[PDB]
Amino acid sequence: IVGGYTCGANTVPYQVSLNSGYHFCGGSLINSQWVVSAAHCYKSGIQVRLGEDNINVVEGNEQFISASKSIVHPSYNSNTLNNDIMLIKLKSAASLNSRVASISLPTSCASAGTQCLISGWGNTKSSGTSYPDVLKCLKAPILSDSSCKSAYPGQITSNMFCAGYLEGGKDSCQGDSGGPVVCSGKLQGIVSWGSGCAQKNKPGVYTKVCNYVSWIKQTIASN
């Protein structure tokens, strides 16, 4: 997260870290046994880390649970990045508490201008490299599909949406993928891609979760 702030220990209880020997992506807990992340975050031997703040130190509220299943959307396209969503089942059910909680799925899509919370342990620099120990947060608005398409000609599908600030300086970055974009208590987006990070006229692109609610519910129930 570039241009954000320190969330505060466990203030984003649904945020999880995907670990494969190190943190490589984020995710969102939707129930005690399921996590929503990005399709490009599919990797071997995933271990989901819940209740995390400082990802480099054991603080006492962590729950490390291996992925028992990793279901990438059947229509995911690794070239266009369309349908960039993946569902991860936890090998054992997570113990829910104030620091480990699920986030509700949306009932309807969010309108342009709606303020949302984006979080993750990704790069905090637009130019250069710096990865945080603790979870970072960013308040950013959903942008119009017209502005999103103008920013990324011929790249925005109906399953993507832009969020952020056109002037640059505030955005999600490498290491944030798969993480949440929560608006009014609903998971509206998944950190997906963009042209660099926090660049002027290049807002972050996110997977449009509201288009996948029925698929998410049915897929979880069939696994």
């Binding site: 190190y22 990005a38 993928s177």
Partner: protein, 58 residues
């Protein structure tokens, strides 16, 4: 033809922080770099062994 082993490492547009290997011609060895998760170029390997086997001595 152009040697793909001599191309600079490519992170790509996606926002994952996946550690991969690339052959660094200037240094003469396989080094680590951050791959974003999509649109990988060929000078991108999952292990140092894969990198050396494919680009060693380029």
């Amino acid at each position: 033809r152009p040697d793909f082993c001599l191309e600079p490492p490519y992170t790509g547009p996606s926002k994952a922080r996946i550690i991969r290997y690339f052959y660094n011609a200037k240094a003469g060895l396989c080094q680590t770099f951050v791959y974003g998760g999509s649109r990988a170029k060929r000078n991108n390997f999952k292990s140092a062994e894969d990198c050396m086997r494919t680009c060693g001595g380029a």
